[PDB]
């Protein structure tokens, strides 16, 4: 069937396509059904909806669809109707337990950015993988096939770093400093993180109060290319678009199998071409991975991940118990991470972890002899020669090289909570303290979140006070503070 | 959030609920995000889609949702973010091959029907079910969850018969011929068949061609109640409202777990108070049931299933390779079935297959001595007191019970397929055949069909016609013509 693109004022959260009820029955097209529009070369695929709003010889395209094709309102296009895609079949049987061929991975993830696979074969695709599982050659391949179907960036400069945190952890804000200390060192570091979600806070949501987030991937190379290191949000770019796609199916079920999830994280940096890769891996109760002996073992997988893909890799094990530094929330985080930058001295959990994952980082480029990465690292922050590199990354975003950190705004809205008892605070809850930064509004609002005075092992007196919850609402603040009551995150004894 | 609801002309086959830009940044509310819509007793769970359709201080709510709910327009509702359902969390433990515990399982069922849980879990759980399967405890709960959770008739007349057929056969009208001499016993079978998804036709598509078939439950016993039996439509009511939603996602991606499956089809009949239900296994190639042995294990399990619901379950074992009959599609099936039940005569699968069962039937309804029902229900069609029978059924259901049979209308456009050869006919593919029909137009057109000339094990000289091709229009025809060709439905040895 041939008809007129018409463009659709609506965000789905899926390509969505309207059609006649009249021309819809010639086609004998029903509700939620799959159709193929084309034109020339490009096409795209689409669920069905149908409508009276357009009328016969019209297809209604939402602007979802606009983001990754271009279609022209007033364009003709040729509506088809879609056969269950070939690509099912190899999802079960991988439900089945069997392994998978590569090429019958590529197919299964080249459904997936194409959109012929939908949330029901996704979330099965997902629910397979954790049930039954990915052996290593299935990951790497799945991890090579990821990358190549989105957009790939190549960089003149050599060698290129990365540094990956799986998270877990609020307020991890390190990566901030780390990146402006290992360019210092001249090393190449493009990083790209993502907004949160699910967290109160996100590197990109972090970097957007001082910096513009967004980027071009070829404006992102410019960057690069004379900066040495960005601070870009990966969401914009097409990189590991299967990866964003298969999360959606992750968060809900609340399940993340760690096969896709290796090959998720290293999906993007080899896209980018980084070279040499450090992996975090925040361990503690509250945090993704529990154990130090679940972490040596990811540990483990991540760097075989690299050999298969011929990158180098090494991974740090770190302590995720508590939330780093005394900030919670995108606002409050920055002015955290930008005045260590700038002063130099700074919380000691944000510290000495971002100079020893940078040092870990400059070992690793060949700037700093083995066993002196830390050092190195301590003394570029100190120097303010770190702090340079930052402003040079800030101004090649667009940020104002000339802010300063007190200027930022926090929440005008503040509750503060004092302990209960005289003692020693024995543990902090990082659910808790996220989930009750978000009700305070995070990270919607920056200037909400929340201020922590103590950390573990802290003695603590009566009347003493824990953290103070910053909301941009009042009506917000009631909420988080109710949250917060509840709760009671920090545990003196 | 209050807000006026606002009914927009379109049905996206999900309760879509639409909202401002503006509103929604207020709200954090982002694109398929689940909110919950309510206003007095009245709630509604529906997936956010960002639309500049509605204006500020308005929600829209596409017409899937008057569908259960009595909201008008203009209405003032108030519009809360749902969280996650409770529920995932069982959906989790299916996951890991934990067994269900009663609670749990019903727990999934409310939110299914509900509509708290999406395409991404329900997915989750019927893959879990088919990767993990379903115990027997669990069927039971599963079943009498879903029938407990809908609308249930309590019918007056006792004791109550009911027939259905796992089908996947082709042509099988012989439910038709079941009911009415069934009936005419003085026995109660009320069935409530549905449309045909992926076959050719349905039963009620079959009785719609003579008869209106879309009725209220309070409609529906008062016509068993004077009539004794109906042959009505399934989805008009709202029966086990969770089969057809978790019929969608196993549809979707090719599959079907037996518990899920005996759940499903036994569940419709819980809620209608069948206490004598007669299962159907039509076993053979190209029929769900592929072998007498797979046949038989089901059967062991649906008379199980049974006895836990409080109903005498009893199952047979038929062929089913062939095409019933010689008619395939909706005009041709009524005519076929119709044409026996006054004539008392009429071909050999049909009303064999169709007298054996309804004397299973008869003898479990007590009407006859063991052994003696097939016999029964050959002089109850023989004697006319069938087809008196089906007239009331049609009377009530609003149709002539004076058309004639050779009356009703078939496709104007055919084509006729010869014997390329001679010989004897050694197979007919159902799936072949029915692909046929289907491309013709059935079941959307009553007129598009197949006509069969042939059984299998005829000889046939060449130059003998094979089946013959009813198309309401050309372009339709020619298509399955094509299909036709390159099919092959019919072998000859």
Request: glycine content about 10%; hydrophobic content about 40%; proline content about 4%.
């Amino acid at each position: 069937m041939k008809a007129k693109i018409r463009i659709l004022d609506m965000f789905s959260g899926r390509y969505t396509v309207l059609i006649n009820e009249e021309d819809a029955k010639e086609a004998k097209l029903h509700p939620d059904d799959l159709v193929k529009i084309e034109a020339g070369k490009k096409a795209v695929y689409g669920s069905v909806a149908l409508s009276n709003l357009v009328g016969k010889g019209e297809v209604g395209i939402s602007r979802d669809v606009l983001d990754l094709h271009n279609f022209s309102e007033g364009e003709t296009v040729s509506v088809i109707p879609a056969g269950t895609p070939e690509s099912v079949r190899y999802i079960k049987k991988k439900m089945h337990g069997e392994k998978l061929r590569k090429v019958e991975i590529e197919a299964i993830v080249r459904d997936i950015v194409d959109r012929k696979l939908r949330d029901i074969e996704i979330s099965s695709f997902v629910t397979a993988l954790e049930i039954n599982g990915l052996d290593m050659d299935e990951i790497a391949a799945l991890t090579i096939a990821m990358a190549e179907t989105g957009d790939m960036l190549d960089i003149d400069r050599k060698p290129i770093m990365d540094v990956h945190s799986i998270g877990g952890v609020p307020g991890n804000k390190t990566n901030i400093l780390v990146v402006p200390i290992v360019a210092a060192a001249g090393l190449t570091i493009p990083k790209t993180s993502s907004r949160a979600i699910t967290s109160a806070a996100g590197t990109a949501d972090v970097v957007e109060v001082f910096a513009d987030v967004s980027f071009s991937l070829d404006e992102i190379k410019r960057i690069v290319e004379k900066v040495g290191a960005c601070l870009v949000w990966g969401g914009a770019l097409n990189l590991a678009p299967a990866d964003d796609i298969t999360i959606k199916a992750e968060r809900a079920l609340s399940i993340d199998p760690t096969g896709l999830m290796l090959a998720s994280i290293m999906s993007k940096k080899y896209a980018m071409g980084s070279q040499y890769v450090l992996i975090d891996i925040p361990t503690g109760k509250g945090v993704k991975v529990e154990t130090v002996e679940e972490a040596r073992s990811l540990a483990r997988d991540f760097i075989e991940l690299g050999k298969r893909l011929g990158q180098y890799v090494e991974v740090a094990i770190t302590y995720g118990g508590q939330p780093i530094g005394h900030t919670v929330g995108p606002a409050l985080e920055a002015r955290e991470a930008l005045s260590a930058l700038m002063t130099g001295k700074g919380p000691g959990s944000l510290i000495e972890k971002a100079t020893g994952l940078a040092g870990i980082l400059l070992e690793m480029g060949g700037v700093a002899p083995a066993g002196t990465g830390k050092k190195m690292a301590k003394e570029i922050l100190e120097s303010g020669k770190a702090w340079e590199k930052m402003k040079e990354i800030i101004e090649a975003q667009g940020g104002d090289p000339n802010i300063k950190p007190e200027e930022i705004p926090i929440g005008d809205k503040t509750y503060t909570f004092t302990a209960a008892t005289s003692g020693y605070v024995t543990a902090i809850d990082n659910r808790a303290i996220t989930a009750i930064a978000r009700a305070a509004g995070a990270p919607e609002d920056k200037g909400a979140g929340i201020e922590l005075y103590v950390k573990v092992g802290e003695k603590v007196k009566e009347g003493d006070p824990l953290f103070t919850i910053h909301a941009e609402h009042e009506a917000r603040l009631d909420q988080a503070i109710v949250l917060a009551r509840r709760t009671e995150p920090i545990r003196i004894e």
